[PDB]
Amino acid sequence: NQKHALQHHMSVWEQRTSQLRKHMQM
Amino acid sequence: KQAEHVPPYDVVPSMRPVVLVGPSLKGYEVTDMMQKALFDFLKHRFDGRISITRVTADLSLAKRSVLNNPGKRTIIERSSARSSIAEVQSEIERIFELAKSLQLVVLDADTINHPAQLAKTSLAPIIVFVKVSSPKVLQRLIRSRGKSQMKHLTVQMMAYDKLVQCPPESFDVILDENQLEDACEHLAEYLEVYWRATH
Amino acid sequence: MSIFYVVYFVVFPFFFVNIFVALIIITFQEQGDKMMEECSLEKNERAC
Amino acid sequence: SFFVLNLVLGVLSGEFAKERERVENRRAFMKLRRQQQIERELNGYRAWIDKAEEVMLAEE
Ligand SMILES: CC(C)CCC[C@@H](C)[C@H]1CC[C@H]2[C@@H]3CC=C4C[C@@H](O)CC[C@]4(C)[C@H]3CC[C@]12C
């Protein structure tokens, strides 16, 4: 929608799972 | 420098006609149905202000420096007398006068499949592209059409990839939306501002 | 008639209750901080 | 009873969170996400086909 015109309340689980993913590929 | 002598000023219609290209070869069940839904909104939204016409002949060969008079008469029995250039060359004035009335005209040819084929025509309408974000939905959409469409799926997908390679820039406007109202509003907004841009 | 009770036990106390527990677990907002940009780069190393 | 149940729940939830980020699980979830995205984009286009089809029959 922000492109059609052109032309952090996460829970503890969400934060920890997002951080666990970016530190897994390495 | 008379080999080409490209003119600086070329006669163009007063109002840009409307051409819709994509997502594959025209004249098939999927592409005729895909493109037809857009016209009905134009008729209902711009009723009393839009002219709707369908042309069956080819238009990619609409050139300006072919000859002094290619096929002037059909009684000379020349090469162009029996050819299809006589009717095609006659109808290019038909679109010119229709747009001269300061009213929009839609074009429904069954021969346009790429903006590069309409890059050498003095008519030069508005190129609007209806495209799917991914190729994976095309084959699944073809499967629901019927058994006849699956037989021509090989050629149906042939143009989809090729038409993707065309610079978006080449297209005048894009319609990457997937619903009715957003696409209808997006198309109407451009033309409504364009309608007030000519007056 | 023990089919009814087996199906009931498989559905409600074995599946729905664990659904409630999982939903509470995965949607637990932090209470002590209640802040948006505490470190904005990490969360665990703040103690470290 | 209560403390052991709390510890079991915590350990199990932590292990589930840790194991949800394995490579195979991530691949399966990405496959499911792409399937759902394709279906979502395909459903919107089907409205065009029916809306057009209704109009032409109405205008014969
Ligand atoms: C999606 C949810 C709501 C499905 C619920 C299905 C439940 C209610 C159904 C599925 C199997 C069913 C049972 C199958 C067999 C029998 C034996 C028969 O002599 C009496 C009914 C009884 C005991 C049925 C009671 C209703 C039952 C337990």
Author numbering:
A (entry chain A): 724 to 730, 773 to 791
B (entry chain B): 163 to 361
C (entry chain A): 1399 to 1446
D (entry chain A): 339 to 398
Q: What does the literature reporting this entry say, word for word?
A:
The R-type voltage-gated Ca2+ (Cav) channels Cav2.3, widely expressed in neuronal and neuroendocrine cells, represent potential drug targets for pain, seizures, epilepsy, and Parkinson’s disease. The transmembrane regions of the α1 subunits all share the canonical voltage-gated ion channel fold, wherein four homologous repeats (designated I-IV), each containing six transmembrane helices (S1-S6), are interwoven in a domain-swapped manner.
The full-length human Cav2.3 ternary complex consisting of α1, α2δ−1, and β3 was recombinantly co-expressed, purified, and analyzed with cryo-EM using a protocol nearly identical to that for Cav2.211. The overall structure of Cav2.3 is nearly identical to that of apo-Cav2.2, with the root-mean-square deviation (RMSD) of 0.81 Å for 1905 Cα atoms in the α1 and α2δ−1 subunits. Five PIP2 species, 34:1, 36:2, 36:1, 38:3, and 38:2, were detected in the lipidomic analysis of purified channel complex. As the recombinant channels were expressed in HEK293F cells and purified at 0 mV, the purified channels are likely trapped in an inactivated state.
